[PDB]
Nucleic acid binder design. Structure first.
Lengths: 158, 298, 169
RNA sequence: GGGUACGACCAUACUUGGCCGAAUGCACCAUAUCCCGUCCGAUUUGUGAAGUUAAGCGGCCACAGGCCUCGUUAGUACGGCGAUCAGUGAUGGCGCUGGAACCCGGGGUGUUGUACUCU
RNA sequence: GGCUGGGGCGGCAUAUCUGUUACACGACAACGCAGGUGUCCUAAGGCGAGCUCAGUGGGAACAGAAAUCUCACGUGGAACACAAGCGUAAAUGCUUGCUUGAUUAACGAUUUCCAGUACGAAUCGAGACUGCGAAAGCAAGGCCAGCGAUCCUUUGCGAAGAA
RNA sequence: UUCUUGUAAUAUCGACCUAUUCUCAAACUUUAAAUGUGCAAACAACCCAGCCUUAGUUAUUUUAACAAGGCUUUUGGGUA
């Protein structure tokens, strides 16, 4: 059985990788928040505080909190027969807003905007096509296949 | 210099690159990063960066908000506007750094109207006042963040010569409110902590200059050289060391009294004018033919 | 052409190795000191060698860096000792050169037996007009090739003034 | 359009070499009384005038270097799927599903905000 | 005692830390592989500023390969108290400068391991009070191992006032 | 060897340089799968108003901004 640091390491994961070294950007810091955001978790390294244990990068949870430097994310962690919500104390630097949800809503409103426009706003306005289908065809030059060995002396392994 | 390394693709492979103004070596982020950073928690409150700048003997001021996709300059002015306000020779010195701060401060805060909240002394002893909110005697005021902010540097030579100190002082008094630890102004001992505002004021009132514009010439005058070699404009455009305080003093007042911006030639510059001497990226298809014909040749 | 494109001495770079320290080094210090009338910089050993019979952090040399008129003078003096005759081998190609001399009095320094004498190491750096780019932080930058020196410029410079003779062929 | 400047983005932005640069400006560049700071005015501090675009800087150039980027490779490889089947054993094997890296080719070679300027 | 390819023995796989096994989430055994821990450190803490390596060349009395000196390179290849691993370069390094935040708390809130006990160990606020700095800011002793119930002892916990 | 012998030349083969080049990794590694792994997919919603409130934002509300939440008869009002 194995050794256990709460920050017990790995091979090639935590290490800060391919030209991706160094501090978080100021863009990172310019960000802005509100709570309830569904944001995803990543690990810089940078400061080895506010830094989750292993579970958590690549997972999406929801923020419940914004503290000075940091934000609270409750995440559902799967134990036995359940997922428990865990509320984790990160400083802001280790988390980011997805698109996961964004689209859904985005579309939903956009669509509504259109659906609404379409009735009950002014205009009227084509989008898409159906799915997939049949068709007339006037092709104009079919081929076939003849494979391997003819002129194999030109090619193949030795 | 010296070499035996690959410096090619494996090298490249083995190169990281650092930020643009490190490619440039224009700006060192760490502090900007740290300066810029703002408690989110405390809102999206506007954490303003004051851009603080000197070119090779030239002063530049701006009031900024730091931002993505570029930061944003709300106000700025620099040493050649001081001519509107009559300080025209002077522009490196401690005095001229200062001046610049009072103006911009004022114009910006005139931007939110404030001719007067935060519009300070006119004395310019060269002492200290921090912040806190106080009352309401000044004016031209309103609810949008009361106007304090932070200095953007990139050179910790915070000496008792450093005329960053000057600008600040004007900056602040003319409108700004970044306070500070008053510890290395001109005439200021940290050690056994002492301020001679007076001399700092003297520095703000160029008297070191006055004297150096004394010392340099009329004395040196005995001989033709030294006298023939610096401050040329200054006594070429003839002032006398003494005159000094007035112009500043009144400038200061004029500035503070109204900052309201000077023009420029102003009709549209020329765009074709610069582009007129340029080159742009060559033509490869063609280049291949050009190179190709040559290697074909010799 | 050239408009102003100079060649200048950047700075004079003396070293006095004292393979040991203490008194000989302090004693040396005074010499080197007065000579340059500066605060020379002390060099110590910086590792224990044992082959040299020296250790780490000995205080094993002073050296001093000199700028200004003084240098130019000193240059000539030392060249004087050395009567303006030098090895090509004395030169880094980096656009500098050095030579060692035993004995200091001929530099022109008034003898005293107290100090006595030392054998010292002399180093000469040369520069050009307008150099500043490679030494002022913000947007410090490497040197333009058409300002990049080499050894030649200096030998030619020497021949032109101080009237270099390069030994050799 | 450039410049300037603050950028933001952070390599098509990069090493390397040429060639060239109007303006504004940058720049180099002089100085060190003051302040300032340094063995050292090199840095820095302080002053800033004479020079000088040589460098920088800029822009371009380049069977340049690098990157960038696509294609190419290759449904191979490599996975997924099977009761089944051949196989000394690995395997190999089908049809059902997915799916390369390198290579070479090809092309590409910073983007663009904010404030300022410069007809 | 146990442990354990029987017991014994040896070994410690018994609290443990690391890296690796281990299937590109997560989790996974062996007396598997390769390693560690019982301390260390008033700075090796903490903060600023400054400074930049590993490494290579060229020169420079003595001095030669190896002294220093010095130019000059040089994506860290170092270096960072330490095993190991992570990170990382105008710093996190490194040097200097200054310090005591290795501080004090209603100390809630928080995580990890997980029984969703625990300790241990971590994370996030708030209050102090300091430090440091130009300033944003940082600073609750590099980050991860280096550590301890009930039970017992002991050390520390208002004087001062107004009844 | 020619040269004394050469910090010689010239041969000389090595060292070294360099580009070349084979063949390779559990604790190597750019890139990088497949196969997996988080989340998200609705009304307790959207908007529009205009509200309420805040010892939220070194404060200036105020016909500030934002923040923030609370509201909101017949949605208040609209809106699937």
């Amino acid at each position: 059985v194995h050794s256990h640091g709460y920050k017990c390491g790995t091979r090639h994961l935590f290490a800060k990788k391919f030209r991706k070294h160094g501090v978080p950007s100021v863009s990172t810091i310019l960000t802005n928040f509100k709570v309830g955001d569904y944001v995803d978790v990543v690990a810089d390294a940078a400061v080895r505080a506010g830094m989750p244990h292993k579970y958590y990068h690549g997972r999406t949870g929801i923020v419940w909190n914004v503290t000075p430097r940091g934000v609270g994310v409750i995440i559902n962690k799967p134990v036995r027969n359940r997922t428990v919500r865990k509320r984790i104390c990160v400083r802001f630097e280790h988390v980011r807003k997805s698109r996961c949800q964004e689209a859904f809503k985005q579309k939903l409103k956009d669509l509504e905007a259109f659906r609404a426009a379409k009735k009950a706003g002014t205009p009227l306005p084509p989008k898409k096509v159906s799915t997939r289908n049949g068709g007339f065809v006037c092709p104009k030059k079919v081929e076939v296949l003849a494979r391997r060995t003819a002129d194999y002396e030109a090619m193949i392994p030795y | 210099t010296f070499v035996k390394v690959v410096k090619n693709k494996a090298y490249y492979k083995r190169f990281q690159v650092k930020y643009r103004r490190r490619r440039e070596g224009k700006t060192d982020y760490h502090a900007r990063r740290r300066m810029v950073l703002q408690d989110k928690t405390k809102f999206g409150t506007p954490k303003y960066r004051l851009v603080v700048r000197i070119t090779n003997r030239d002063v530049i001021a701006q009031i900024v908000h730091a931002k993505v996709v570029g930061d944003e300059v709300v106000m700025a002015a620099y040493s050649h506007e001081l001519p509107l306000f009559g300080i025209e020779h002077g522009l490196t010195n401690y005095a001229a750094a200062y001046a610049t701060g009072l103006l911009v401060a004022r114009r910006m805060l005139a931007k939110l109207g404030l001719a007067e909240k935060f519009v300070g002394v006119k004395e310019v002893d060269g002492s200290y006042a921090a912040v806190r909110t106080k009352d309401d005697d000044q004016g031209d005021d309103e609810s949008r963040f009361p106007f304090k902010a932070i200095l953007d540097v990139g050179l910790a030579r915070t000496t008792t010569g450093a005329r960053v100190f000057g600008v600040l002082k004007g900056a602040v008094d003319g409108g700004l409110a970044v306070p500070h630890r008053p510890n290395r102004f001109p005439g200021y001992n940290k050690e056994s902590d002492a301020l001679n505002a007076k001399v700092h004021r003297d520095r703000i009132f160029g008297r070191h200059v006055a004297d150096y514009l004394k010392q340099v010439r009329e004395e040196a005058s005995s001989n033709p050289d030294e006298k023939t070699c610096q401050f040329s404009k200054f006594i070429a455009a003839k002032v006398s060391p003494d005159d000094m305080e007035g112009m500043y003093k009144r400038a200061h007042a004029a500035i503070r009294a109204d900052p309201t911006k000077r023009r420029a030639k102003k009709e549209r510059p020329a765009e074709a004018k610069p582009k007129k001497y340029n080159t742009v990226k060559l033509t490869g298809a063609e280049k291949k033919a050009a190179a190709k014909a040559k290697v074909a040749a010799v | 052409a050239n408009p102003m494109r100079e060649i200048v001495v950047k700075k004079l770079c003396i070293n006095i190795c004292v393979g040991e320290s203490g008194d000989r080094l302090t004693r040396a210090s005074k010499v080197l000191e007065q000579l340059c009338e500066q605060t020379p910089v002390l060099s110590r050993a910086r590792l224990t060698v044992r082959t040299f019979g020296i250790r780490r952090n000995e205080k094993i040399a002073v050296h001093c860096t000199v700028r200004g008129k003084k240098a130019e003078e000193l240059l000539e003096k030392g060249l004087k000792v050395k009567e303006f005759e030098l090895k090509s081998y004395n030169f880094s190609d980096t656009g500098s050169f050095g030579f060692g001399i035993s004995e200091h009095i001929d530099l022109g320094i008034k003898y005293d037996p107290s100090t006595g004498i030392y054998g010292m190491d002399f180093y000469v750096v040369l520069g050009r007009r307008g150099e500043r780019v490679a030494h002022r932080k913000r947007r410090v930058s490497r040197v333009g090739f058409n300002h990049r020196v080499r050894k030649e410029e200096a030998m030619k410079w020497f021949e032109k003034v101080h009237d270099g003779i390069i030994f050799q062929a």
